[PDB]
Structure 1
Amino acid sequence: MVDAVVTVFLEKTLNILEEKGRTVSDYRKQLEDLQSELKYMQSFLKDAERQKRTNETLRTLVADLRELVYEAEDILVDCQLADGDDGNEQRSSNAWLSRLHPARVPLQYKKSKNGTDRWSSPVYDHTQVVGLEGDKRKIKEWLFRSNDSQLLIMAFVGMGGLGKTTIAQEVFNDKEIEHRFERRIWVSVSQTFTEEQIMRSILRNLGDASVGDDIGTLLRKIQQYLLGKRYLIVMDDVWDKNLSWWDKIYQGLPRGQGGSVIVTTRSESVAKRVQARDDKTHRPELLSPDNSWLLFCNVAFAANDGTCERPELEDVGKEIVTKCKGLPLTIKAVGGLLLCKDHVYHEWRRIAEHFQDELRGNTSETDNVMSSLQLSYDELPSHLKSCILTLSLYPEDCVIPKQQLVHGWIGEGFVMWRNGRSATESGEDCFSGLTNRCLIEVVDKTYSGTIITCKIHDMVRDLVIDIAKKDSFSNPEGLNCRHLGISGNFDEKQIKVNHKLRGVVSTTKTGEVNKLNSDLAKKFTDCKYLRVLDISKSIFDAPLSEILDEIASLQHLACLSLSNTHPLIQFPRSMEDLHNLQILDASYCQNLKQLQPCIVLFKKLLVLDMTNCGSLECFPKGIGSLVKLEVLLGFKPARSNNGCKLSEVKNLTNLRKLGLSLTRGDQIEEEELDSLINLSKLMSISINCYDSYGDDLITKIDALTPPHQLHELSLQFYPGKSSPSWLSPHKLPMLRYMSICSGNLVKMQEPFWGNENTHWRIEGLMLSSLSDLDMDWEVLQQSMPYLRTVTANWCPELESFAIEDVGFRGGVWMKT
């Protein structure tokens, strides 16, 4: 990733050489030759990390070229904010430029002969599946015979990434199997399991919280929420060390009511300990030499929908596939990389030759998957290397939220936004470009196709940890770390913190909270070059306005994210003189009873995210004085002068997401209903009227006209009885997604159907738990031509829909 650090430093020299706050001075001439030598580094930096292995004499040189760019940045950004006289800064970088010639000449003896990935703009969602139908039916039919034994156990034994969890999730998630089994339980147990949240992760889909107590009360709710019903339990990736919980649970769940247990595991020697009667153990198969190339065509082309139209690369496409032996994720990782190139026979044969020579030492088979993932990591573009490198820190098979990653990637300068492309859209095409190489698989979606959470395959993170530990970006079990993070309850370590430390994230596994102390929390503000202080879910011992008093010592913050922290009331009083701070995320902190008035002052930020802060009295008045921000959520405008109004939002030309939280009718003033009309770049509003008292709130929502080019909207509560008379296909033509949550809305007005010869162009629609709607179904389809999905959730009195029971359970209604 030395190319991935030099590409960051070159743009931080582009945006400070062109800034012209320092026209001609001392340390500028010695910076332009620094960038002119780092641009000549990059002709041979890609093959340097291709040859970090097999030459330690190259490894130490590349490690020093890496480590000196960090000292370059820590004196670049300290001299960006200075505008003073510091003679003790030029003659340091004189050495740290003059010592780079002994860091290139011994490398140029050894070789001896931008950051825009243009294959990231369409996202593909590669999850197709091939060659399993017989092998899926022949273990359907075992589960339809679950009554013939007292209890059934399914044992899947294969190698790493052979396709075990996929054939699990095509039987666990089938319709006619869902009719047979009442409840079904999907739990992942690995070597980090702690033996209690196995039971709590089972019980999380069975009804109640697990108070910390004895194992008997743990078993009582499992036995009474599964009292003789036909259940299903999938425990996944079971490891034989500390296996003995399986007999502490297997002698506790009731036999004699049908059901089955699915246990997937790698090693063969534990399947007898599974005691699963080997004919009902199932070893999945390697792919055939025809289906493997079919999956390769289905991934690697994806624009002609899986057809080799150009015949000059058909031979090479078969010849690469017949090296990776029909094992699925090797061929899909290679196909995900070959999606990114697609055209030139030379560019295909070059990485075919690199896949051939890089693989020639295995004497193994998992070395094949860890050779092809190394191939996919090396041939990746530059700044995405650090993007998957920061994903190493998340724990064993965790569920990783998307904004947690993306607001980190814009934190350490791993992102690029230069020419009107917004920094929140460029923060996520660098995610969609990682979902194209099949290095990141998407787990959760919305109705609108956006992504909430995320995870990676288990064999991938071993590569990512191994490539991080050699390069000192991870391994908290130790000291040298560029970016650290604390997982669930590691205060007993009390990790020593020093001047490198370019980030702290908090990683919890969806339900747990890592409680902290006042001991190590004060040690964050002893750092002096920290970037990302991302402390999510947290219980402290002191209020945060006392803990974080020392942010005067910090200056290079890019983002706070204090979300779901309990002991905070005020943001700390010495946030007055931070300068950069591109993101202040503080959502769901539901008793910060004032937002501190210094956020008028810094003109830098991009994201101000405060969804559902249930007690927050309006956003001090100068919020129209920061022309750069883009995501403004949870607004709550003022009464008379105690904050800012919607007339202040009219200036912010750069925003694209917006979220209002209108609660009283006197928040919207009458002479400024004209506000939300000229925001040319807006994409998704959301109006959350949870507390709502006045009747004038209805007559002051309905006069708000959202812009001509709105792409998405959503109405959370909206206590009005009918439609707001701007939900018409005239006044918002290009609307493509729309969702209406709970409330008191009864019928839709006559301009809503808009029955001219014009229509809606809506492709997605959600109608969750309203209780008083009455609309037909043929009137929808005549008025709205190309709906695809209608997810209605809990809305009775709409029985014209083809959803199965529209008033008592969700449906989707995929289009025919």
Structure 2
Amino acid sequence: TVSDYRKQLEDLQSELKYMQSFLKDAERQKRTNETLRTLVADLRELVYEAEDILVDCQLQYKKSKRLQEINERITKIKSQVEPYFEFITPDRWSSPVYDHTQVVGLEGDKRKIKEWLFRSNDSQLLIMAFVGMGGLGKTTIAQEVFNDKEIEHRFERRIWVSVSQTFTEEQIMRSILRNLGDASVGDDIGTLLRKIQQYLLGKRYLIVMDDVWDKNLSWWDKIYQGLPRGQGGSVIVTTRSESVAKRVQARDDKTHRPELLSPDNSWLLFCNVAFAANDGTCERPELEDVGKEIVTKCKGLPLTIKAVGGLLLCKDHVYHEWRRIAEHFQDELRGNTSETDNVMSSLQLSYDELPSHLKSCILTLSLYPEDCVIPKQQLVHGWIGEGFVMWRNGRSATESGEDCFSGLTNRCLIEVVDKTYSGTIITCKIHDMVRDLVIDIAKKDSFSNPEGLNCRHLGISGNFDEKQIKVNHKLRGVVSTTKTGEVNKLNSDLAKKFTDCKYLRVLDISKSIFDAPLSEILDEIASLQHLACLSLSNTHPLIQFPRSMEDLHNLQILDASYCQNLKQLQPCIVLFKKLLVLDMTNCGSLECFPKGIGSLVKLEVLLGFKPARSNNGCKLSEVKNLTNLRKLGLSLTRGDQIEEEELDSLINLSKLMSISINCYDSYGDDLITKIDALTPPHQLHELSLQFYPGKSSPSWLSPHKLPMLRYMSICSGNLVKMQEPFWGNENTHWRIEGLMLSSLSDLDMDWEVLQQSMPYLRTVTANWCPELESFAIEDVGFRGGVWMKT
């Protein structure tokens, strides 16, 4: 029982190795019967248990008991379910034919797309994209366009092609020939391309390709060269992605995005569907309040509105079922009136073409309240923390979170909320039909139960001081989800029971007020061993994080932002050498670092550095050692924060992208004189100096010292004018693109001098500059404009 402990280890290390590979195959299988989905549904929990207890291999007898009992469990369920598979022996389309009476107003978009199609001869081959989420109006606006009369006056051959998510090239191109009027010839591929090329000479053709996905998309540029150019032809690709809109490369302007319906438009849509007997009109007025409540709760999608209309069409129009459907809503559209209309299938097919890590990343958004506005940064740090992101080829921590987030937003699953001047995204939200889809998929494998026992991670809402959330010992994550402004009122015993979870990788506490100081609350985090992230942002009783933080050897990131009382950072955040993000933004009262910051090397984000004094903290000398970082945040207080021969400490950062300088609590002119030798690298994408007590430019702000600057913002400051190296217009220019001047009451410059010094501007967002009165925006003084040029 002890001598075989390695052997009875390693077969488990084999068996997990097979079974998750089996769980990379069964979801790629169509026609899933009930036994298949049930044994996948418990093999996922069994995978969680196996890789849960497998980490304990890093007496040697109780572990052998655990290995033995779970091996017997897995072999028993295999031999228990296999004869049921021994016993038994083992479509979506579209069309240009629609009804044109229930189409609630689209005539502005119809007009815009018709004036887009009238300019087809201006390009060689006008291609267009209709990008939006599932069931939004894309195929209907396409059918509304090219069934108009004026398009048939313009285009003489109109071709509809229904490309499903499952297809082949052969049926696509022979369907093109069937729409061309040629007979269905049993024929091979190159002859079909020759025929498609031959039937399109001198003909102003319009093809509309529907439901184009990003799966084996290379067929596009096996037929894109087969289309004749210069004839004024036009392609309209309707799809659910911007990634295919750039792979087809329509244009950034030729993409049309349909919008959600207004409540008046959605209400007469629902009248036209549900009350279809008496001419689409409401007959009895006791249903109008409940009906308008249902319609305003459907929130804009025509698919859900027509589904609820088809659901209520087979009732007797009495008040009680209407009222209960108004208060029980999600549970019926997931029954689909027992599988007839299938809204959930039309969104689940958009779910079911993600990569598996993106499936895991989109699955965690079932953990948030009703319409909360989710910050990007917390999602990205959770994904990096509990391991939904892998990396080897340099795309290590932050940029992999960036392209996973952009991969989700390019599937039209997550929509943005606000965007800065520099195009980066800070907050995002999701449509609620996607939200309860992801909840119902979390109602499977024990990702997010949230009722009952078996959960793998949990999210806390507001004010659980008294409601006593159940917490079992599985708990791979604990997140704090607030609805943009509330604070989770928490007591002490829940935070004590957080430290009882052995397997807890994500612990982020974002808006919470505790009863005791957090030094003795989290004193037993030595019991936490495989913890990857901590964002202890915005907590009241935090003064000193606990001193039992020596055995946390994993600790991939460490966040504490906007906590104004953080006096001492311990010297134990030096030795563990496996850090990625250290993030202290705007933490005022802070003794500005420990010593060996340059000792750990694998970190990428270092915000709020506060370079220390002589016999204090750490200087800027070891920043030369940090050859992997790409975001860096400085904040300066007085003159002796920086040292003379360290003033060239920012030239050897090869992979650096952005710099933020926070000279908020500045003291003397010595700081102003000593800033001007800090030279950024010649590669630099964004810089944001934001309080800057100097009066002139910092004397490196020139295209000679940093040529590749694209985005730039200047917040508040004592800045009066720019020096002569700031223009430098003999032959060099900025190649800068986004510029922001937030609150400057002393800054004076011109506008055409900027336009002859910055030839590549797009937008300039200035909103408090009472002294220019020469820019093209509506007022550079009190309010703000953007100057979105052509």
TM-score using structure 1 length: 0.65
Q: Secondary structure at the match of 1:533?
A: strand
Question: Quick check: 1:448–1:764 contact (8 Å CA) kept in 2?
Answer: yes
377-386 vs 398-407, which deviates more? 377-386
654-663 vs 123-132, which deviates more? 123-132
Work out the CA distance in 2 between the residues paired with 1:339 and 1:673.
75
Work out the CA distance in 1 between the residues paired with 2:756 and 2:279.
31
Question: Quick check: 1:383–1:414 contact (8 Å CA) kept in 2?
Answer: yes
In the alignment, what sits opposite 1:309?
283
In the alignment, what sits opposite 1:49?
27
Shift of 1:749: 0.4
1:190-243, Cα deviation, whole Å (9 max, x unpaired): 999999999999999999999999999999999999999999999999999999
Work out the CA distance in 1 between the residues paired with 2:467 and 2:159.
34
Is the aligned partner of 1:26 residue 2:1? Answer: no
Question: Quick check: 2:204–2:233 contact (8 Å CA) kept in 1?
Answer: yes
Q: 1:632 to 1:129 in 2, by over 3 A?
A: farther
Question: Quick check: 1:200–1:209 contact (8 Å CA) kept in 2?
Answer: no
Work out the CA distance in 1 between the residues paired with 2:770 and 2:152.
24
1:751-802, Cα deviation, whole Å (9 max, x unpaired): 0011121100101000111101110000001000010000001112111101
Q: 1:188 to 1:525 in 2, by over 3 A?
A: farther
Shift of 1:397: 1.1
Question: Quick check: 1:624–1:651 contact (8 Å CA) kept in 2?
Answer: yes
Shift of 1:328: 6.5
Question: Quick check: 2:214–2:243 contact (8 Å CA) kept in 1?
Answer: no
Q: 2:555 aligns with which of 553, 573, 581?
A: 581
Q: 1:255 to 1:371 in 2, by over 3 A?
A: closer
491-500 vs 24-33, which deviates more? 24-33
Work out the CA distance in 2 between the residues paired with 1:468 and 1:259.
46
Work out the CA distance in 2 between the residues paired with 1:209 and 1:664.
83
Shift of 1:129: 16
Shift of 1:422: 2.3
1:508-558, Cα deviation, whole Å (9 max, x unpaired): 111111110012111100110111011111111101011111101111100
Shift of 1:506: 0.3
1:378-403, Cα deviation, whole Å (9 max, x unpaired): 22111111111111011001100001
Q: 1:685 to 1:478 in 2, by over 3 A?
A: same
Shift of 1:433: 0.5
Figure out how many residues of one structure are paired with residues of the other and give that number. Answer: 765
Unpaired runs of 5+ in structure 1?
1-22, 82-107
Work out the CA distance in 1 between the residues paired with 2:414 and 2:347.
12
Question: Quick check: 1:558–1:582 contact (8 Å CA) kept in 2?
Answer: yes
Question: Quick check: 1:383–1:415 contact (8 Å CA) kept in 2?
Answer: yes
60-69 vs 228-237, which deviates more? 228-237
Shift of 1:673: 0.5
Q: Secondary structure at the match of 2:193?
A: helix
Shift of 1:618: 1.4
Q: 1:784 to 1:572 in 2, by over 3 A?
A: same
In the alignment, what sits opposite 1:111?
63
294-303 vs 579-588, which deviates more? 294-303
365-374 vs 689-698, which deviates more? 365-374
Q: 1:360 aligns with which of 327, 334, 354?
A: 334
336-345 vs 553-562, which deviates more? 336-345
In the alignment, what sits opposite 2:343?
369
Q: 1:112 to 1:672 in 2, by over 3 A?
A: closer
Q: Secondary structure at the match of 2:212?
A: coil
Question: Quick check: 1:121–1:432 contact (8 Å CA) kept in 2?
Answer: no
Shift of 1:324: 18
Question: Quick check: 1:377–1:385 contact (8 Å CA) kept in 2?
Answer: yes
322-331 vs 688-697, which deviates more? 322-331
Unpaired runs of 5+ in structure 2?
66-90
In the alignment, what sits opposite 2:73?
none
Q: 1:383 to 1:768 in 2, by over 3 A?
A: same
In the alignment, what sits opposite 1:767?
741
Q: 1:448 to 1:589 in 2, by over 3 A?
A: same
Question: Quick check: 2:742–2:768 contact (8 Å CA) kept in 1?
Answer: yes
Shift of 1:630: 0.4
Question: Quick check: 1:333–1:438 contact (8 Å CA) kept in 2?
Answer: no
Is the aligned partner of 1:79 residue 2:53? Answer: no
Work out the CA distance in 1 between the residues paired with 2:709 and 2:96.
20
Shift of 1:409: 0.3
Q: 1:147 to 1:505 in 2, by over 3 A?
A: farther
1:287-314, Cα deviation, whole Å (9 max, x unpaired): 9999999999999999999999999999
41-50 vs 125-134, which deviates more? 125-134
In the alignment, what sits opposite 1:500?
474
Shift of 1:470: 2.0
In the alignment, what sits opposite 2:611?
637
691-700 vs 49-58, which deviates more? 49-58
Q: Secondary structure at the match of 1:272?
A: helix
71-80 vs 306-315, which deviates more? 306-315
Q: Secondary structure at the match of 2:362?
A: helix
In the alignment, what sits opposite 2:15?
37
Q: 1:735 to 1:191 in 2, by over 3 A?
A: closer
Question: Quick check: 2:2–2:64 contact (8 Å CA) kept in 1?
Answer: no
Question: Quick check: 2:647–2:678 contact (8 Å CA) kept in 1?
Answer: yes
Structure showing greater relative contact order (alpha-carbon pairs closer than 8 Å, 6 or more residues apart): 1
Work out the CA distance in 2 between the residues paired with 1:416 and 1:170.
45
In the alignment, what sits opposite 1:94?
none
Is the aligned partner of 1:525 residue 2:477? Answer: no
Shift of 1:181: 43
Question: Quick check: 2:125–2:233 contact (8 Å CA) kept in 1?
Answer: yes
Question: Quick check: 1:723–1:748 contact (8 Å CA) kept in 2?
Answer: yes
Shift of 1:639: 1.0
Q: 1:731 to 1:232 in 2, by over 3 A?
A: same
Q: 1:170 to 1:752 in 2, by over 3 A?
A: farther
1:670-715, Cα deviation, whole Å (9 max, x unpaired): 1111101010000010000000001110111110000011111011
Q: What is the Cα-based RMSD across aligned positions, in Å?
A: 22.2
Shift of 1:453: 0.3
712-721 vs 303-312, which deviates more? 303-312
297-306 vs 195-204, which deviates more? 195-204
799-808 vs 272-281, which deviates more? 272-281
Q: 1:773 to 1:412 in 2, by over 3 A?
A: same
Shift of 1:419: 1.9
Work out the CA distance in 2 between the residues paired with 1:662 and 1:395.
39
Work out the CA distance in 1 between the residues paired with 2:583 and 2:681.
22
Work out the CA distance in 1 between the residues paired with 2:753 and 2:465.
60
Q: 1:511 to 1:652 in 2, by over 3 A?
A: same
Work out the CA distance in 1 between the residues paired with 2:645 and 2:255.
73
1:68-98, Cα deviation, whole Å (9 max, x unpaired): 32233234433349xxxxxxxxxxxxxxxxx
Q: 1:665 to 1:682 in 2, by over 3 A?
A: same
Question: Quick check: 1:120–1:430 contact (8 Å CA) kept in 2?
Answer: no
1:438-470, Cα deviation, whole Å (9 max, x unpaired): 111111110000000000001111111111022
Identity among equivalent pairs (%)? 100
Question: Quick check: 1:583–1:607 contact (8 Å CA) kept in 2?
Answer: yes
Work out the CA distance in 1 between the residues paired with 2:326 and 2:686.
44
In the alignment, what sits opposite 1:745?
719
32-41 vs 228-237, which deviates more? 228-237
Question: Quick check: 1:151–1:260 contact (8 Å CA) kept in 2?
Answer: yes
Work out the CA distance in 2 between the residues paired with 1:187 and 1:170.
16
Work out the CA distance in 1 between the residues paired with 2:185 and 2:591.
36
Shift of 1:162: 5.8
In the alignment, what sits opposite 1:169?
143
Question: Quick check: 2:592–2:610 contact (8 Å CA) kept in 1?
Answer: yes
In the alignment, what sits opposite 1:251?
225
Q: Secondary structure at the match of 2:328?
A: helix
143-152 vs 123-132, which deviates more? 143-152
Work out the CA distance in 2 between the residues paired with 1:765 and 1:681.
23
Q: 1:248 to 1:711 in 2, by over 3 A?
A: closer
Question: Quick check: 1:337–1:376 contact (8 Å CA) kept in 2?
Answer: no
Q: 1:770 to 1:50 in 2, by over 3 A?
A: same
Shift of 1:52: 10
Q: 1:53 to 1:255 in 2, by over 3 A?
A: closer
